[PDB]
Amino acid sequence: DSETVGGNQTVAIAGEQNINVDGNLIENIGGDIDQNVTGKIEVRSESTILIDADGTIIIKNDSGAFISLGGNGEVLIQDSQGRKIRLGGAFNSTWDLNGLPMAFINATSV
Amino acid sequence: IRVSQNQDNPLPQINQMVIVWFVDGDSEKGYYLPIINDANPSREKDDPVNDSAVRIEGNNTIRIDKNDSETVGGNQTVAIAGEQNINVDGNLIENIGGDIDQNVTGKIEVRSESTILIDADGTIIIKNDSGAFISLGGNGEVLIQDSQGRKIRLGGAFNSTWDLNGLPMAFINATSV
Amino acid sequence: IRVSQNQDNPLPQINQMVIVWFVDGDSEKGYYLPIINDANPSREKDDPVNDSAVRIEGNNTIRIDKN
Amino acid sequence: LSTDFIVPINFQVSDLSGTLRFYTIGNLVIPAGATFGTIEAIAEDIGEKYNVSANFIDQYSTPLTYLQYVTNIRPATNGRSGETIDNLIERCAQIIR
Amino acid sequence: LSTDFIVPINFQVSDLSGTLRFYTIGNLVIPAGATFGTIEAIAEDIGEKYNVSANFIDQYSTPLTYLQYVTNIRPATNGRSGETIDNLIERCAQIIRIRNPVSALDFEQLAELTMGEGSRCKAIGLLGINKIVTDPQPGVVHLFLLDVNGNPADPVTISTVGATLQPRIMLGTRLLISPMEVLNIELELIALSDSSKTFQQLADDILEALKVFFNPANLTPGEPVLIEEVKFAIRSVGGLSISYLQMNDNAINIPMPNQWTIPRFSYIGFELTDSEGTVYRDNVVTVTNPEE
Amino acid sequence: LSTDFIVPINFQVSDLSGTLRFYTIGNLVIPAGATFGTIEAIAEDIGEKYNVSANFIDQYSTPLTYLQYVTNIRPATNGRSGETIDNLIERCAQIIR
Amino acid sequence: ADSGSLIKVDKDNKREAGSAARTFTTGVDVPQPQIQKQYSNPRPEGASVKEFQLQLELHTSQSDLENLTPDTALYIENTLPFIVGKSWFIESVRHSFSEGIFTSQVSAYIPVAPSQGVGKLPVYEILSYRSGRTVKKITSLQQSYEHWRGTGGYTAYKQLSGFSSPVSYMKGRPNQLVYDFILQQNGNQSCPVPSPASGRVVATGGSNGMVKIDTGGGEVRLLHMSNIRVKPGQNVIRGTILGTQASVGGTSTGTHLHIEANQFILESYVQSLVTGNW
Amino acid sequence: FTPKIRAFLDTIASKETAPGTALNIEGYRSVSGSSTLFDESEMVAGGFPRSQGSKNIGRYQFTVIDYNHARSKYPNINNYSPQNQDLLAYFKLQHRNVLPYLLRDDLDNAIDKASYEWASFPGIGKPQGQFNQVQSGTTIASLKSYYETRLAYYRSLEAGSDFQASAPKDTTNNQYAGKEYKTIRTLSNSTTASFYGYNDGFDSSDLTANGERFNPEGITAAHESLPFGTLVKVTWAVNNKSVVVRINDRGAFVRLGRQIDLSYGAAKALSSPGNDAIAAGLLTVKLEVVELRTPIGENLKESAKNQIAENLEKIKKNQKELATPEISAKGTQITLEVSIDRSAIAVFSFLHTGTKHNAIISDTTTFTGQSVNWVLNRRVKNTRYTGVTLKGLAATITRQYGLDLDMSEEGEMIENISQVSQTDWQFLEKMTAIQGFGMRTVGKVLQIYKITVNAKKLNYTISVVDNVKSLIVTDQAQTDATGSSQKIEHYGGRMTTVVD
Amino acid sequence: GAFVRLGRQIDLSYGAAKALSSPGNDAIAAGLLTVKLEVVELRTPIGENL
């Protein structure tokens, strides 16, 4: 089956969409992807997951906690209260603590 | 005979019945249209009056020069035995009013070259069958756990925590602390 | 003339050929259907018998109330 | 059109009711590429009832190909059912002198 | 097309005005895959008014499937309304005296026959292959030919006339045949109109009179064109008074370059003035190209 | 075909022009499952003009069902408009001896 | 129906129909059945139209019995001027015999009196063939081998500039090269054979499918073509389908193509077969 | 101004314009021998630009002489506009015999003929073009290349992307055959095959399952399940050479996985220099199905639409038969004056339509004449009327024949009706009958009246005594069995129920 | 249109240009107008399905 649309394709489904593909799904998008989901997003694979972006990657929530894989190579792990673990985007490996204690448990031979 | 201009519908098969008109009554100017017979039986429908059942025994090719619209008041079910190839030159916008349950037997390759944004309101979990995962909690808790039970904890319930599970840690290539 | 009630298929273009019937033989009551000519040629197909090739030069709007 | 168009002589036109009918004087030749053309028309019969105002004639009975509309841009005039005796007498006298 | 096209016999074509109509001689078969095909057409009626220019006949009424265009690639020629009594007298007298083509005249009349009606010949004695008059070659007769179309003769026509005249020339004599040459005449007329004709009617009448005057049948090859004769031919139209006439940018008689050159008037400009002072200026080119 | 096929006797065939016409000698029975088979044909008229080369006859006027093509695998020969007197004399003399 | 161009078949006859002549057509509803492939139906003969009708009863004589048949032209004399001197077509003759008298009734009447080549073709594959050597695919005349000396050695071999093998030509005609090779279309040797040159077909068929073309300056000859589609006297252009390499009905169901033509025609023929531009 | 003419007019402007402006709009204001363009208002003011009397003006170098010569054929040229300059150039192409050679892509001859009009174009056999205004580097080949580039540019603008599955043909009766052998499906990517008929018992005496004699040298094969006559392309993987075989036999040996069995000739056809198919008993081949087809070409519906449109314009034209020249005294007027007591003479008029004569002894000539309505019933017409009353329709019909109309009532307004294969009298009869009217003819004038029980204005009374000789009164019962369909229409029978 | 110029698709008449004027905005005052061109056509208004 082949489908060629010289303009825009608009799909409006009031019910539930089921897609069952036995082969490979290849998506080549020449623009952007804006995915807005009101419910959950549960992705499951059983061989591998590959996430690649030439630029920056940000995984965040409304709580203000995020994992940022910088486009310059910086790595930033931030929690809601503002404690940060940083690696190296042309700086130093820094464990910013916001003036709060850090705990080691079952520490063996640090 | 066709209903539309640029429609080329599948032809009648051998031994199928058609109705033939003769323009100006000439036997040499005949125009046909297939009918429902037995070599041409009726397709199965839930509602024989309102439902549409179509089968194509060859390839199906639709080309639309202008925009396309599709409204489904119920469920849309797609079953493809081979590959699905989607090529969009513009932006792709999907708004889902429910959940997304994506089950893939093979790999998942996601490639972009500008930015990736993953955002939720609650918890985000990236886990494997090995029991190793990254949990970015909805309350701001951060958990980095491996298979054997070594975890780095940040967030709120506890303080900045590094559970080592009774295993030694290290700092290779260390200049200054 | 249409095959089903709620489809409004594209109309024949200017200079395209159609076949016309006259209800009760009246010249003022004519009903048409497009045919395959050269101003209305055949679309390219791998198998002309089983395959379906359709082109729309405008928008395509399909609305389905049920599944 | 790509070729010259001809509205034939004696082409019948009428008003909305169809009771008043005019006929073209001659052949009207609309040259290739042009769409509009003017000609003169004469009433079907004599009498003052054919003196009609502008934009009063808009129907033609015979449907010709590529012909869209017809109108009159001038009120019909000089429709008469016979001149007076005094005007005839004056005309006769002026011929004498 | 995937099949071979057929333009039927007697296919009618016409000019833009629609008054001149030509009909195809026979059926034309354009083989499948070709896009063009040529065939001869004949005028609807006799007369010199059908002698039209190239590409002047392109309108056709009956439509054929996939037929895109039709046009005459050759200017129609040999339109004749008839012959006068003196022409018929000459035709009768030549039958009286053509026994043994011996003089210049005799030779020319024979060559004009068997080459067509509307052609021309010029017979010159003792003219060698160099075409130089001062070197006479006894026993040599040189023929110069203008074909039925009014152009210098095609080699096939030369061969045909040679074969025709071979069993009629004196034994031992040498017959040379070559095409004729054409001298182009460009006219400029300044004349006063008496208003008895319109400017367009005057121009048409003058053009017709000059086309009659410069007919190769009415012209003697190698003889000078006399400007007084041209003025008389122009004025015989009537309804005008000639003020000035130029031929080839001068007012003097035009001598032909050699013995075998025929005049062929190509361009004429009109400047007609009436009593009221209206100046009508026009220009007509009659031949397709200088070397035609 | 699933059944035996019959090309009937006196079946008219011709060349591309249709001027030379042959007719089959008898019924041709193509057995079930077989597709392409052969039979003898005779010219419509006497004369040497019907002697034609192989692959020259390929048209048949009556369009029969399931029949696709016809050809001639031999050049048609022995078309004659009457023998010579000398050959007849020889034939007569040979009978005697 | 294929083009929908609404072609007209005859000059209209709007005689005594009205003064308009531009709003009506003066015809019927049912068209005539068209008989020819491309030509249109002939105009009504007119000799079937009666303009005069004459009833003739006469005392039967022997001459009026043997010479009075519908195949003769009647000439009635000593009568009205419009009857005298005209040929009357006998519609019918009747001979009655009620008693010793023979009576004749004659119904008679008077008839009314009076491009270089094709555009595009599918790509072909050309395989040079020799009786001894193996058949090899070629792209031009330069790569090939000359064919054998056929039935009396009409071939002679010369040496040319770019040919990788001796060039074969007819004896006495260096210009006229002769070759034997196999055409192919998608691997099929029963493909149609496009014409190698434009000209007039002068002779077809014969012992071995000889198509002969008169190009105006030379002759192009082709051998071993079956199912010839061109007739003698026909005009063909470059790329016209002259016939088939091998017939479908198993007429030995295999052979090559023999071609005699000059060097330029053969080179352009191979180039057009390979490229598809004609 | 198709792409060909457009490209040629560019090839002309490439050398006949001012430097730097060959495709620019400003090049339409070029001046010969000068890089300065003339006034923009001058090209529209009308006539010909007077600002430079002697110099050549325009994109194509023209003077007032060429302008007048063009106006001799195209009088609509009133000013010197880019459209008007293009039309003048097209006229010059027409007159110099450049169009016939340009329309069939003979660019050498087209340039040769155009060299007589434009001095910058070289001629055939002379790179001076019968003049000496040919610049350096200007040759016929360069002009051809420029024309090809311009034509390609013009064609690329309206280049489509659809494909055509059919091919144009001149006539519906005419038919054409396929030209390409298209692969349909792949029977087997790789299967083992063997050849039969070589050093075996299979000779020309055997019969194939087709019913044909076996030709071992033929390109044929036996397949297990394909129908006879199926064309199978067999490709040998060793040399990548493919040959099309025709399935005729069914095969005797079954073996395992043996779909096809080639003949000896078919196997020999697979051999290539250095690769002998017969050398290897078993060939690993690929099987495909091919079929005769029409090659798929570019869609030409856009050109076909233009062709249909121009044919539609051309068919509507005066192509009728001329009047027949018939010198005779037959069709004249018959005027009859008749009286019975010489008190008054009654006059009637008819048209002569027939004549009879008995010649032998009974010198008798019989003349027959008919009313003028016979003129209306002579020719069958096809026409349509819309928005016309009964009186208007009758008036037009009578005016078509020079008759007079006498009808007091206008009648109803007919909105849409078609006269299909009917004479004018028949159409008038139908229209008057459907409205309850009837016609009558006297002399030249046709009168239309209402069919009412009280319509005879004058009354004439006679007595049976002393005047009449016969009187037969008849009465019949109405029935649908007899009469015509119109008779039962006038009775109760009618289609009362109709569909909107 | 007589003048061709560059990028000139339309040329309004004097009355058409005057019809574009509004209180405080004279179209004739500005020789060149930056305008948007659309094609309109007589139509039957789209109503609720009955």
Author numbering:
A (entry chain E): 136 to 245
B (entry chain F): 69 to 245
C (entry chain D): 69 to 135
D (entry chain k), F (entry chain q): 99 to 195
E (entry chain n): 99 to 390
G (entry chain A): 601 to 714, 736 to 899
H (entry chain C): 101 to 600
I (entry chain B): 351 to 400
Provide the publication's sentences verbatim:
A-1(L) is a Myoviridae cyanophage isolated in 1970s9 that specifically infects the model cyanobacterium Anabaena sp. PCC 7120. Using cryo-electron microscopy (cryo-EM), we solved the structure of A-1(L) tail machine, which consists of three parts: a 205-Å-long neck, a 1045-Å-long contractile tail with a complicated baseplate, and six pairs of tail fibers. The dodecameric gp2 portal, the pentadecameric gp5 and the hexameric gp7 sequentially constitute the neck of A-1(L), to which five neck fibers are attached. The long and contractile tail of A-1(L) contains 24 rings of gp10 hexamers that form the tube, surrounded by the sheath of 24 helically stacked gp9 hexamers.
The central spike/trimeric gp25, hub/trimeric gp15, six monomeric gp16, and six wedges/heterotrimeric (gp31)2-gp32 form a compact baseplate at the distal end of the tail. The central spike locates at the innermost of baseplate, each subunit of which adopts a conserved structure: an N-terminal α-helix, an oligonucleotide/oligosaccharide binding fold, a consecutive β-strand domain and a C-terminal loop. The N-terminal α-helices (residues Met1-Arg30) of three gp25 subunits form a tripod to interwind with the tripod of three C-terminal helices (residues Pro666-Ala689) of TMP via hydrogen bonds and hydrophobic interactions. The two interwound tripods are surrounded by the trimeric hub, each subunit of which adopts an architecture different from the previously reported hub proteins. Besides the conserved barrel domain that is commonly found in most myophages, the hub of A-1(L) possesses three extra domains. Using in vitro enzymatic activity assays with the commercially available lysozyme as the positive control, we found that the endoglucanase and peptidase domains of hub/gp15 can hydrolyze Anabaena sp. PCC 7120 cells. Six gp16 subunits adopt two conformations (termed gp16A and gp16B), which alternatively anchor on the hub to connect the internal trimeric hub and external hexameric wedge. The C-terminal tail (residues Ile126-Asp152) of gp16A deeply inserts into the barrel domains of hub, whereas that of gp16B forms a four-stranded antiparallel β-sheet with the α/β domain of tube initiator. Moreover, the N-terminal tail (residues Met1-Leu20) of gp16 runs downwards to recruit the heterotrimeric wedge, which is composed of two gp31 subunits with different conformations (termed gp31A and gp31B) and one gp32 subunit at the periphery. The insertion domain (residues Glu81-Gly180) of gp31A inserts in a cleft on the hub, whereas that of gp31B stretches outside to hold the LTF.
